[PDB]
Amino acid sequence: FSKEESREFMAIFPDIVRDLTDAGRHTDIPEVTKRFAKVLQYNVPTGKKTRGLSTVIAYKMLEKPENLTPENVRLAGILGWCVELLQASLLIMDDLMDRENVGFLAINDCLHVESSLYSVLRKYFSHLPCYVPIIELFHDVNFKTNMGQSLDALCMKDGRPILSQFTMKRYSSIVKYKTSYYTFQLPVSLGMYLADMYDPEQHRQAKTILMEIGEFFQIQDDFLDAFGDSQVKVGTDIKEGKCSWLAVVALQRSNPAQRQIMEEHYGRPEPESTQIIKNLYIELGLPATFAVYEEESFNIIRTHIHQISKGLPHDLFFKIMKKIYKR
Amino acid sequence: FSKEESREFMAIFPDIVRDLTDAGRHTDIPEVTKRFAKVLQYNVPTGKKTRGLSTVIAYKMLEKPENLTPENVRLAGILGWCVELLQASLLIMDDLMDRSETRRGQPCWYRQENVGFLAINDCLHVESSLYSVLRKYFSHLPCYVPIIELFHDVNFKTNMGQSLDALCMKDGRPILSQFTMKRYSSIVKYKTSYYTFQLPVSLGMYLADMYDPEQHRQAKTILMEIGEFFQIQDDFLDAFGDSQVTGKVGTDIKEGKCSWLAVVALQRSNPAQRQIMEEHYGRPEPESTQIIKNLYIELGLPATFAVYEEESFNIIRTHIHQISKGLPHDLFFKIMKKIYKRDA
Ligand SMILES: CC(C)=CCC/C(C)=C/COP(=O)(O)OP(=O)(O)O
Ligand SMILES: CC(C)=CCC/C(C)=C/COP(=O)(O)OP(=O)(O)O
Ligand SMILES: CC(C)=CCC/C(C)=C/COP(=O)(O)OP(=O)(O)O
Ligand SMILES: [Mg+2]
Ligand SMILES: [Mg+2]
Ligand SMILES: [Mn+2]
Ligand SMILES: [Mn+2]
């Protein structure tokens, strides 16, 4: 993203904190509002805000050039921060399920941070025609993300992976509901609504390509968890018994002997068991299978983007595609 | 509540479960929608649904008599179930946070096989679900956005209450310097009074197309006063109630809760009595709970509660008489009549 784009986006964050914790209200509960300021400051604005900045870029590429005022680009930035509040709530839920001090999280902090995005939406968007579509989008994406988290959990029982559950159909459903809706659909649909693009067929056209990009994003992430260079963090998907693309394709390709290695060694704490699974992935040619998928999926997605109709700009989707595939 | 009111309200619940789990959506993930039906069935419909039924009663007393149709009373019932969905989400999370054993005689959801900390996802899922119910039944009505905004605002405020409650503890040990009547009043207001008292009445007002900010303000003032008495009565009965009639053995002392009893005990205590609270309050040993209970008796908290109950009843009744605009006084007298001198 541009130096200008990053600086104007980051400049919004302190306002959102004041809006949620000060707002010149002279609160009767300053101790807990000061704590909530720290929860927001310590968890929301740090590292890459790729979903938030992607909301701004989406809007800038969908809106009429004449309507790209500083005021409208700032509203796009505020929507991006609502996406980052959602992201923060989900990472807090992950931190809590993993497991006072600086960086302490309360169990209800994830519910509280999630709820806060609706206060931001009400403050800035309640008088604009895009308001109800935007709040309904957040409601629907929230519900779908929760269903994705539950589907992922239904691949584990008594701390053991249920390998009978590791199908490509279930995997595709987990990625779609748990990740693709809030990561890929939400930023683009927000940009479209702020640009007063309400046509359901336009949103459906964007959705089809964004779910395809989302699936490759997660498959690449899964591949690199096992086969990536740590010095470019250490992957724990095998140890944690995750429903990974690697595990799903391993089970498709496995003979009975190879399947029994997965049953015995997948989702075990012992480092030796991780190396046994990695050795099986190498034997089954999962790297070559990933290489073929990467090429074939790139070509199909590029084709669908070139074919994008309903008055949608293809360059927006190419920018996203190029970002994920690193063309 | 009438036999009719209870049965018509209960008839709505299975429709809401179908709306959220069997309405032709998410056909690729039936195992999730089937599980979510079980989450709703366990956590939402087995209580007294006092907040849900109170939404219907509020609406019936606020709406113009000639406007009360079976169709509009059903919409009030659906809003009542949305309150019960919010409450279910909050209590799923609170039971995990407090590591509680039971809730309304049922094992806490987080204790059920293969849930534990996944109760966090179920909490967020149940809370998110009420906005899908609002969309289906209210999207075409003027009250739609005010009701959405009220639910999100009450969720935010309830979280401020829960987090303020947590700031009365340091790593599972009560901070007795934090146990002031000011902090107690703030915890009750934010953590329980907004969702329990303000939310049902404000929903009734919005469905009756009552949007006057001053009406909502006057309603809030009296409902926060009633809400404080209700929680003080609840706190008193945790220690001094009969387990067989309350339907629960009280563990507030064991849990180190910022209860009205603990707050008033500290106000009334000499330094020796303060030392007993410092040493024994919030301890797991049954002997420590008995020592605190015995100190509450020594300090005359039963007599103190009886005086508070009579004085606060009189003060709130006076305030309801002074309510202006066109708010029905009878709504607030009906709440008081239900609440005052209760033993459960
Ligand atoms: C709509 C879009 C494009 C959203 C995707 C958000 C996302 C997590 C991308 C990863 O890129 P990154 O630059 O944050 O990560 P890395 O440094 O690993 O490439
Ligand atoms: C606006 C009004 C008057 C709301 C009703 C408040 C109330 C008395 C709740 C009691 O709930 P409960 O202890 O019966 O619990 P539950 O209904 O959850 O079982
Ligand atoms: C944001 C969240 C999760 C809010 C929880 C709200 C609530 C009503 C908790 C119960 O309070 P308690 O723990 O003091 O009482 P009990 O469990 O005894 O009902
Ligand atoms: Mg990963
Ligand atoms: Mg109690
Ligand atoms: Mn509790
Ligand atoms: Mn609690």
XYZ file of C-alpha atoms and ligand atoms in Angstrom:
732
model
C 0.000 0.000 0.000
C 1.096 3.659 -0.627
C 2.860 5.688 2.153
C -0.154 8.100 1.860
C -2.737 5.218 2.151
C -1.011 3.704 5.268
C -0.545 7.094 7.076
C -4.164 8.312 6.455
C -5.514 4.845 7.561
C -3.380 4.735 10.775
C -4.358 8.407 11.552
C -8.020 7.217 12.077
C -7.238 4.674 14.870
C -6.782 7.144 17.822
C -10.226 8.713 16.970
C -11.958 5.260 17.057
C -10.381 4.616 20.531
C -11.620 8.053 21.842
C -15.083 7.410 20.241
C -15.415 4.047 22.111
C -13.819 5.098 25.501
C -14.009 8.969 25.853
C -16.401 10.820 23.428
C -16.366 13.710 26.016
C -19.134 11.801 27.935
C -17.381 12.130 31.386
C -18.209 8.410 32.025
C -19.348 7.204 35.523
C -17.057 4.100 34.955
C -13.599 5.509 34.009
C -11.554 2.513 35.405
C -13.166 -0.018 32.961
C -13.281 2.470 29.977
C -9.498 3.117 30.519
C -8.978 -0.708 30.526
C -11.006 -1.056 27.261
C -8.827 1.708 25.670
C -5.760 -0.500 26.497
C -7.503 -3.665 25.086
C -8.071 -1.751 21.784
C -4.578 -0.095 21.762
C -2.679 -3.331 22.651
C -4.530 -5.676 20.148
C -6.142 -3.759 17.180
C -3.628 -1.352 15.482
C -0.367 -3.453 15.423
C 1.267 -5.285 12.455
C -0.216 -5.517 8.912
C -3.846 -4.247 8.668
C -4.232 -5.968 5.237
C -8.060 -6.506 5.562
C -8.588 -2.857 6.700
C -6.359 -1.325 3.976
C -7.964 -3.691 1.351
C -11.396 -2.139 2.283
C -9.986 1.359 1.407
C -8.364 0.111 -1.895
C -11.650 -1.704 -2.844
C -13.634 1.563 -2.314
C -11.035 3.701 -4.236
C -11.285 1.273 -7.250
C -15.162 0.949 -7.173
C -16.228 4.606 -6.468
C -16.508 7.278 -9.235
C -13.245 9.350 -9.228
C -15.395 12.540 -8.637
C -16.741 11.070 -5.308
C -13.240 10.155 -3.898
C -13.199 13.178 -1.498
C -10.926 13.137 1.609
C -14.209 12.750 3.627
C -15.386 9.628 1.656
C -11.872 8.001 1.663
C -11.830 8.550 5.485
C -15.262 6.777 5.789
C -13.712 3.845 3.781
C -10.843 3.895 6.347
C -13.368 3.732 9.243
C -15.070 0.662 7.573
C -11.561 -0.896 7.255
C -11.054 -0.340 11.032
C -14.444 -2.096 11.661
C -13.027 -5.113 9.689
C -9.822 -4.859 11.847
C -11.983 -4.747 15.065
C -13.624 -8.020 13.835
C -10.133 -9.490 13.021
C -8.901 -8.398 16.522
C -11.950 -10.089 18.193
C -11.185 -13.384 16.300
C -7.408 -13.282 17.150
C -8.365 -12.607 20.853
C -10.717 -15.687 20.745
C -7.708 -17.706 19.331
C -5.377 -16.296 22.107
C -7.975 -17.326 24.792
C -8.465 -20.904 23.388
C -4.589 -21.211 23.267
C -3.622 -19.691 26.709
C -2.691 -7.535 35.801
C 0.080 -7.959 33.138
C 0.447 -5.864 29.941
C -1.256 -8.022 27.236
C -3.702 -9.743 29.676
C -6.994 -10.704 27.904
C -10.349 -11.332 29.671
C -12.628 -14.014 28.083
C -15.336 -11.351 27.337
C -12.767 -9.024 25.601
C -13.444 -10.926 22.295
C -17.276 -10.314 22.604
C -16.606 -6.670 23.685
C -14.180 -5.851 20.798
C -16.605 -7.500 18.278
C -19.575 -5.449 19.699
C -17.498 -2.208 19.448
C -17.456 -2.302 15.571
C -21.297 -1.787 15.625
C -20.833 1.367 17.834
C -18.355 2.696 15.175
C -20.816 1.840 12.312
C -23.710 3.625 14.144
C -21.534 6.718 14.869
C -20.257 7.283 11.280
C -22.760 5.580 8.855
C -26.271 5.719 10.505
C -27.389 8.685 8.250
C -26.030 7.201 4.940
C -28.065 4.989 2.535
C -25.381 2.198 2.810
C -26.029 1.850 6.627
C -28.542 -1.081 6.747
C -26.789 -3.129 3.978
C -23.442 -2.676 5.867
C -24.817 -3.675 9.330
C -26.687 -6.691 7.742
C -23.415 -7.732 5.961
C -21.487 -7.639 9.315
C -24.366 -9.590 11.026
C -24.364 -12.291 8.265
C -20.511 -12.557 8.089
C -20.331 -12.809 11.956
C -22.924 -15.671 12.008
C -21.167 -17.488 9.084
C -17.680 -17.078 10.741
C -19.103 -18.654 13.969
C -20.493 -21.597 11.879
C -17.012 -22.018 10.264
C -15.323 -22.101 13.730
C -17.873 -24.780 14.846
C -17.337 -26.863 11.618
C -13.522 -26.755 12.253
C -14.137 -27.913 15.902
C -16.288 -30.881 14.601
C -13.043 -32.346 13.029
C -11.683 -32.968 16.612
C -13.030 -35.197 19.476
C -11.371 -35.948 22.894
C -8.173 -34.090 21.749
C -7.815 -36.443 18.688
C -8.448 -35.526 15.006
C -11.450 -37.378 13.395
C -9.749 -38.297 10.050
C -13.101 -39.641 8.630
C -14.158 -35.907 8.738
C -11.101 -34.792 6.622
C -12.879 -34.567 3.189
C -12.169 -31.894 0.498
C -15.915 -30.916 0.669
C -15.666 -30.288 4.482
C -12.242 -28.537 4.060
C -13.668 -26.150 1.359
C -16.667 -25.418 3.697
C -14.339 -24.653 6.711
C -12.197 -22.203 4.643
C -15.309 -20.500 3.116
C -17.236 -19.968 6.429
C -14.319 -19.606 8.934
C -12.019 -17.352 6.814
C -13.025 -16.345 3.228
C -16.303 -14.487 4.128
C -14.691 -12.041 6.655
C -11.195 -11.872 5.002
C -12.063 -11.537 1.248
C -15.853 -10.950 0.764
C -16.328 -8.450 3.656
C -13.753 -5.774 2.541
C -14.924 -5.816 -1.148
C -18.702 -5.852 -0.316
C -18.094 -2.913 2.151
C -16.286 -0.948 -0.617
C -19.233 -1.705 -2.968
C -21.920 -0.565 -0.437
C -20.030 2.715 0.404
C -19.869 3.293 -3.429
C -23.740 2.807 -3.430
C -23.432 -0.515 -5.391
C -26.379 -2.581 -3.985
C -27.102 -4.919 -6.995
C -27.169 -8.501 -5.558
C -25.810 -9.938 -8.907
C -22.715 -7.618 -8.570
C -22.096 -8.843 -4.954
C -22.633 -12.491 -6.160
C -20.105 -12.014 -9.065
C -17.469 -10.573 -6.621
C -18.278 -13.394 -4.094
C -17.589 -16.251 -6.626
C -14.022 -14.989 -7.451
C -13.232 -13.945 -3.816
C -14.177 -17.440 -2.453
C -11.869 -18.999 -5.167
C -8.970 -16.637 -4.143
C -9.714 -17.365 -0.431
C -9.415 -21.149 -1.026
C -5.948 -20.801 -2.696
C -4.824 -18.356 0.097
C -5.584 -21.010 2.787
C -4.218 -23.980 0.705
C -0.912 -22.031 0.223
C -0.888 -21.188 4.004
C -1.443 -24.936 4.808
C 1.355 -26.014 2.387
C 3.846 -23.484 3.913
C 2.911 -24.576 7.507
C 4.695 -27.948 6.807
C 7.081 -27.083 3.888
C 7.869 -23.335 4.443
C 11.245 -21.979 5.715
C 10.736 -21.102 9.468
C 13.178 -18.098 9.239
C 10.696 -16.703 6.602
C 7.316 -18.952 12.287
C 7.377 -22.746 13.112
C 4.209 -24.508 11.781
C 2.212 -26.664 14.277
C -0.783 -27.797 12.072
C 0.338 -31.504 12.248
C 0.890 -31.418 16.092
C -2.500 -29.605 16.571
C -4.300 -32.147 14.261
C -5.711 -29.335 12.028
C -7.985 -30.122 9.024
C -5.228 -28.887 6.616
C -5.270 -29.248 2.779
C -2.112 -31.441 3.249
C -3.921 -33.895 5.627
C -7.049 -33.991 3.350
C -5.038 -34.746 0.128
C -2.755 -37.209 2.073
C -5.905 -39.224 3.032
C -7.154 -39.155 -0.640
C -3.751 -40.491 -1.904
C -2.953 -42.952 0.988
C -3.057 -46.785 0.679
C -4.251 -48.662 3.841
C -0.670 -48.724 5.345
C -0.244 -44.932 4.700
C -3.757 -44.221 6.179
C -2.750 -46.172 9.376
C 0.396 -43.892 9.723
C -1.967 -40.822 9.712
C -4.299 -42.517 12.304
C -1.311 -43.273 14.631
C 0.832 -40.083 14.215
C -1.456 -37.158 13.112
C -2.277 -34.646 15.921
C 0.350 -35.975 18.438
C 2.515 -33.739 20.716
C 5.816 -35.705 20.133
C 8.121 -33.967 17.563
C 8.991 -37.442 16.042
C 5.275 -37.875 15.061
C 5.383 -34.498 13.159
C 8.514 -35.716 11.227
C 6.754 -39.100 10.463
C 3.741 -37.165 8.987
C 6.097 -34.806 7.028
C 7.959 -37.929 5.689
C 4.564 -39.411 4.542
C 3.597 -36.053 2.876
C 6.982 -36.192 0.986
C 6.428 -39.909 0.001
C 2.856 -39.096 -1.297
C 4.266 -36.229 -3.469
C 2.174 -33.470 -1.804
C 4.746 -30.781 -2.878
C 4.292 -31.795 -6.596
C 0.465 -31.948 -6.019
C 0.569 -28.378 -4.529
C 2.749 -27.112 -7.476
C 0.164 -28.461 -10.027
C -2.789 -27.000 -7.972
C -1.055 -23.547 -7.692
C -0.600 -23.341 -11.533
C -4.109 -24.734 -12.381
C -5.914 -22.554 -9.729
C -3.947 -19.404 -10.822
C -5.047 -19.972 -14.486
C -8.753 -20.643 -13.556
C -8.916 -17.555 -11.211
C -7.142 -15.308 -13.820
C -9.743 -16.525 -16.431
C -12.720 -15.811 -14.071
C -11.328 -12.286 -13.274
C -10.899 -11.488 -17.035
C -14.550 -12.712 -17.488
C -15.902 -10.562 -14.550
C -19.056 -8.684 -15.744
C -22.057 -6.792 -14.168
C -19.983 -3.548 -14.513
C -17.311 -4.671 -11.956
C -13.683 -3.507 -12.494
C -11.358 -6.528 -13.157
C -8.186 -4.587 -12.018
C -9.462 -4.638 -8.346
C -9.612 -8.497 -8.385
C -6.236 -8.780 -10.270
C -4.567 -6.621 -7.536
C -5.956 -9.078 -4.880
C -4.972 -12.160 -7.023
C -1.394 -10.775 -7.572
C -1.096 -10.007 -3.770
C -1.974 -13.660 -2.809
C -0.069 -15.536 -5.631
C 2.912 -13.041 -5.607
C 2.888 -13.210 -9.484
C -48.089 -14.188 33.472
C -51.383 -15.690 32.094
C -51.600 -19.334 30.813
C -52.359 -17.872 27.301
C -49.328 -15.454 27.411
C -46.908 -18.296 28.480
C -48.152 -20.821 25.817
C -48.281 -18.266 22.901
C -44.717 -17.095 23.853
C -43.383 -20.723 24.032
C -44.974 -21.520 20.580
C -42.571 -18.949 18.943
C -39.289 -20.679 20.055
C -39.382 -23.697 17.645
C -39.988 -21.236 14.688
C -36.865 -19.188 15.711
C -34.762 -22.431 15.893
C -35.994 -23.373 12.335
C -35.276 -19.752 11.135
C -31.632 -20.114 12.354
C -30.969 -23.843 11.475
C -33.574 -25.175 8.909
C -34.661 -22.304 6.551
C -32.911 -23.645 3.374
C -29.560 -21.819 4.018
C -26.073 -23.352 4.696
C -27.200 -26.685 3.070
C -23.477 -27.701 2.671
C -22.959 -27.809 6.534
C -25.905 -29.721 8.127
C -23.692 -31.061 11.025
C -23.144 -27.386 12.170
C -26.834 -26.295 11.867
C -27.919 -29.522 13.701
C -25.363 -28.745 16.485
C -26.519 -25.066 16.623
C -30.160 -26.281 17.101
C -28.853 -28.229 20.187
C -26.949 -25.098 21.479
C -30.252 -23.097 21.253
C -32.433 -25.935 22.684
C -30.134 -26.397 25.774
C -29.404 -22.733 26.642
C -32.463 -20.613 25.586
C -35.961 -22.096 26.357
C -35.781 -24.019 29.724
C -35.775 -21.023 32.173
C -38.744 -18.875 33.379
C -38.131 -16.536 30.348
C -39.086 -13.634 32.727
C -37.224 -11.036 30.545
C -38.820 -12.420 27.310
C -42.375 -12.499 28.760
C -41.807 -9.003 30.348
C -41.078 -7.622 26.792
C -44.609 -8.806 25.736
C -46.240 -7.349 28.931
C -44.356 -4.009 28.447
C -45.591 -3.805 24.784
C -49.220 -4.693 25.801
C -49.165 -1.798 28.385
C -47.414 0.764 26.047
C -49.298 0.142 22.717
C -52.694 1.820 21.973
C -55.378 -0.777 22.964
C -56.970 -0.637 19.428
C -53.522 -1.474 17.846
C -53.025 -4.707 19.960
C -53.476 -7.490 17.318
C -52.386 -11.159 17.689
C -49.853 -10.296 14.880
C -48.280 -7.382 16.897
C -48.311 -9.426 20.190
C -46.403 -12.173 18.244
C -43.787 -9.544 17.107
C -43.411 -8.531 20.825
C -42.908 -12.282 21.621
C -40.159 -12.517 18.931
C -38.384 -9.447 20.498
C -38.772 -11.223 23.895
C -36.979 -14.324 22.469
C -34.204 -11.996 21.123
C -33.699 -10.820 24.791
C -33.559 -14.539 25.832
C -30.985 -15.197 23.009
C -28.800 -12.279 24.295
C -29.130 -13.575 27.914
C -28.261 -17.187 26.828
C -25.046 -15.890 25.094
C -24.038 -13.837 28.216
C -24.666 -16.713 30.714
C -22.843 -19.308 28.480
C -19.755 -17.003 28.678
C -20.211 -15.975 32.365
C -20.481 -19.673 33.461
C -17.140 -20.428 31.662
C -15.532 -17.287 33.254
C -16.768 -18.247 36.792
C -16.141 -22.046 36.253
C -19.724 -22.635 37.616
C -21.282 -26.157 37.958
C -24.995 -25.505 37.119
C -27.335 -22.802 35.673
C -31.125 -23.255 36.378
C -30.421 -26.833 37.662
C -28.731 -27.856 34.321
C -24.951 -28.476 33.994
C -23.310 -25.303 32.535
C -22.989 -25.551 28.698
C -19.121 -25.295 28.789
C -19.041 -28.530 30.943
C -20.957 -30.589 28.245
C -18.816 -33.153 26.273
C -16.264 -31.536 23.833
C -17.248 -27.861 24.540
C -15.029 -26.227 27.249
C -13.481 -22.993 25.821
C -15.460 -23.596 22.529
C -18.313 -22.087 24.669
C -16.704 -18.715 23.656
C -17.576 -19.419 19.950
C -21.097 -20.628 20.991
C -21.615 -17.359 23.012
C -20.642 -15.160 19.992
C -22.784 -17.409 17.666
C -25.947 -17.190 19.879
C -25.551 -13.357 20.266
C -25.023 -12.932 16.445
C -28.125 -15.122 15.741
C -30.647 -12.597 17.246
C -29.811 -10.068 14.422
C -30.871 -12.729 11.819
C -34.239 -13.042 13.699
C -34.576 -9.199 13.717
C -33.879 -9.098 9.910
C -36.507 -11.806 9.114
C -39.424 -10.279 11.152
C -38.680 -6.486 11.518
C -36.589 -5.336 8.436
C -39.785 -3.788 6.854
C -40.803 -1.790 10.026
C -39.678 1.664 11.291
C -38.536 0.120 14.665
C -35.920 -2.114 12.836
C -32.786 0.120 13.129
C -33.593 1.504 16.651
C -33.974 -2.155 17.862
C -30.709 -3.347 16.143
C -28.842 -0.348 17.692
C -30.390 -1.020 21.183
C -29.209 -4.708 21.149
C -25.626 -3.732 20.063
C -25.511 -0.877 22.673
C -26.802 -3.145 25.506
C -24.176 -5.816 24.530
C -21.364 -3.158 24.687
C -22.650 -1.791 28.073
C -23.113 -5.345 29.535
C -19.430 -6.085 28.643
C -18.360 -2.857 30.484
C -20.301 -4.216 33.530
C -18.670 -7.710 33.276
C -15.144 -6.164 32.947
C -15.800 -3.726 35.885
C -16.937 -6.768 37.984
C -13.568 -8.464 37.077
C -11.625 -5.323 38.271
C -12.888 -6.139 41.853
C -10.614 -9.279 41.754
C -6.810 -9.738 41.396
C -6.094 -13.325 40.119
C -9.136 -14.879 41.909
C -8.709 -12.855 45.181
C -11.237 -10.066 45.980
C -9.794 -6.480 46.232
C -11.895 -5.262 49.231
C -10.680 -1.612 48.718
C -12.736 -1.813 45.425
C -15.948 -2.905 47.314
C -17.632 0.574 47.503
C -21.403 1.270 47.045
C -20.466 3.535 44.042
C -18.622 0.638 42.248
C -21.388 -1.873 43.240
C -24.131 0.466 41.821
C -22.110 0.823 38.540
C -21.597 -2.998 38.187
C -25.369 -3.695 38.699
C -26.391 -0.872 36.255
C -24.071 -1.994 33.378
C -23.811 -5.799 33.950
C -27.536 -6.657 34.608
C -29.985 -3.644 34.738
C -29.543 -2.575 31.044
C -30.295 -6.076 29.554
C -32.743 -7.212 32.330
C -34.958 -4.071 32.840
C -34.154 -1.314 30.241
C -34.008 -3.675 27.187
C -37.517 -5.300 27.514
C -39.259 -1.901 28.173
C -37.276 -0.022 25.419
C -38.181 -2.865 22.942
C -41.897 -2.513 23.922
C -41.636 1.291 23.388
C -39.944 0.941 19.914
C -42.560 -1.660 18.712
C -45.280 0.852 19.865
C -43.392 3.491 17.714
C -42.422 5.500 20.879
C -39.076 7.185 19.916
C -39.170 10.344 22.181
C -35.638 10.405 23.747
C -37.071 11.981 26.995
C -39.609 9.074 27.401
C -36.697 6.534 27.064
C -34.627 8.696 29.537
C -37.435 8.763 32.206
C -38.026 4.972 31.684
C -34.234 4.322 32.145
C -34.058 6.405 35.417
C -36.830 4.392 37.239
C -35.755 1.008 35.681
C -32.120 1.481 36.939
C -33.572 2.184 40.468
C -35.826 -0.971 40.294
C -32.852 -2.948 38.834
C -30.606 -1.996 41.808
C -33.264 -3.105 44.386
C -33.770 -6.397 42.397
C -29.997 -7.255 42.503
C -29.671 -6.184 46.218
C -32.612 -8.578 46.990
C -30.852 -11.305 44.886
C -27.553 -10.716 46.815
C -29.375 -10.869 50.214
C -31.144 -14.174 49.253
C -27.799 -15.741 48.102
C -26.649 -15.751 51.802
C -29.984 -15.614 53.772
C -32.504 -17.290 51.365
C -33.900 -20.857 51.701
C -32.085 -23.123 49.123
C -35.337 -25.148 48.558
C -37.400 -21.992 47.572
C -34.624 -19.989 45.724
C -33.750 -23.249 43.840
C -29.944 -22.743 44.314
C -27.281 -22.998 47.105
C -25.586 -19.534 47.181
C -21.782 -19.397 46.532
C -21.302 -15.543 46.344
C -19.024 -15.599 49.484
C -16.912 -18.564 48.119
C -16.633 -16.768 44.701
C -15.606 -13.455 46.411
C -18.428 -11.543 44.603
C -18.823 -7.741 45.041
C -22.263 -8.388 46.674
C -24.398 -5.732 48.478
C -23.823 -7.831 51.688
C -19.974 -7.609 51.314
C -20.154 -3.825 50.483
C -22.414 -3.009 53.517
C -20.384 -5.421 55.784
C -17.219 -3.356 55.001
C -19.120 -0.036 55.672
C -20.347 -1.300 59.104
C -17.147 -3.241 60.142
C -14.708 -2.182 62.924
C -11.000 -2.956 62.166
C -11.268 -6.482 63.764
C -14.357 -7.255 61.559
C -12.549 -5.819 58.448
C -9.632 -8.274 59.217
C -12.171 -11.219 59.155
C -13.348 -10.085 55.643
C -9.676 -9.658 54.473
C -8.744 -13.194 55.730
C -11.919 -15.243 54.893
C -13.854 -13.519 52.007
C -13.564 -15.395 48.647
C -11.932 -18.563 50.154
C -12.819 -22.109 48.923
C -12.927 -23.679 52.476
C -16.539 -24.121 53.776
C -15.434 -22.860 57.278
C -14.464 -19.463 55.673
C -17.985 -19.095 54.074
C -19.566 -19.843 57.526
C -17.248 -17.237 59.239
C -18.406 -14.545 56.689
C -22.124 -15.586 57.034
C -21.705 -15.370 60.872
C -20.118 -11.847 60.526
C -23.085 -10.715 58.303
C -25.404 -11.869 61.184
C -23.156 -10.142 63.834
C -23.277 -6.841 61.791
C -27.136 -7.043 61.578
C -27.358 -7.209 57.744
C -30.821 -8.938 57.907
C -32.322 -5.857 59.726
C -30.333 -3.510 57.377
C -31.801 -5.281 54.264
C -35.403 -5.187 55.694
C -35.094 -1.360 56.266
C -33.550 -0.874 52.752
C -36.371 -2.958 51.117
C -39.166 -0.836 52.759
C -37.373 2.563 52.255
C -36.360 1.876 48.577
C -39.938 0.625 47.748
C -41.361 3.950 49.133
C -38.702 6.118 47.307
C -39.255 4.349 43.895
C -43.113 4.545 44.249
C -42.720 8.365 44.806
C -40.467 8.610 41.659
C -43.058 6.647 39.521
C -45.782 9.194 40.619
C -43.462 12.025 39.314
C -43.065 10.336 35.829
C -44.421 12.744 33.123
C -44.901 12.667 29.280
C -47.413 9.815 28.549
C -45.550 6.802 30.071
C -48.086 4.475 31.797
C -47.356 4.593 35.598
C -49.180 1.184 35.881
C -46.319 -0.532 33.895
C -43.736 0.521 36.577
C -46.119 -0.186 39.550
C -46.742 -3.698 38.026
C -42.919 -4.347 37.985
C -42.578 -3.094 41.652
C -45.627 -5.182 42.777
C -43.981 -8.374 41.309
C -40.479 -7.603 42.759
C -40.984 -6.311 46.351
C -40.807 -8.668 49.433
C -40.039 -11.719 47.146
C -38.290 -14.759 48.787
C -36.995 -16.065 45.369
C -8.935 -8.612 0.452
C -7.571 -8.996 0.941
C -6.480 -8.858 -0.078
C -7.356 -9.475 2.157
C -6.345 -10.499 2.580
C -5.805 -10.281 3.977
C -4.548 -11.059 4.258
C -4.487 -11.719 5.602
C -3.557 -11.131 3.375
C -2.170 -11.596 3.703
O -1.208 -10.659 3.219
P -0.189 -9.969 4.250
O 0.689 -9.026 3.494
O -0.971 -9.456 5.415
O 0.678 -11.230 4.729
P 2.121 -11.807 4.292
O 3.136 -10.817 4.808
O 2.238 -13.161 4.951
O 2.097 -11.890 2.785
C -38.857 -5.478 32.541
C -38.926 -6.638 33.487
C -39.958 -6.490 34.566
C -38.139 -7.698 33.369
C -38.096 -8.939 34.212
C -36.913 -8.951 35.157
C -36.868 -10.127 36.091
C -37.760 -10.015 37.293
C -36.085 -11.176 35.847
C -36.013 -12.424 36.677
O -35.425 -13.478 35.923
P -35.392 -14.958 36.537
O -34.588 -14.924 37.794
O -36.794 -15.470 36.586
O -34.564 -15.744 35.408
P -34.956 -16.497 34.030
O -36.209 -15.842 33.513
O -33.769 -16.291 33.115
O -35.158 -17.960 34.399
C -20.334 -9.822 29.043
C -20.880 -10.888 29.942
C -20.360 -12.264 29.653
C -21.751 -10.614 30.902
C -22.356 -11.529 31.908
C -23.622 -10.940 32.505
C -24.191 -11.651 33.701
C -25.664 -11.431 33.892
C -23.429 -12.383 34.514
C -23.827 -13.079 35.785
O -23.289 -12.347 36.884
P -22.634 -13.106 38.135
O -21.556 -14.022 37.653
O -22.292 -12.053 39.135
O -23.875 -13.941 38.704
P -24.443 -15.447 38.593
O -23.518 -16.258 37.727
O -24.471 -15.922 40.011
O -25.821 -15.297 37.993
Mg -1.958 -21.625 8.977
Mg -27.094 -13.848 42.567
Mn -21.482 -16.235 37.303
Mn -19.608 -13.592 36.754
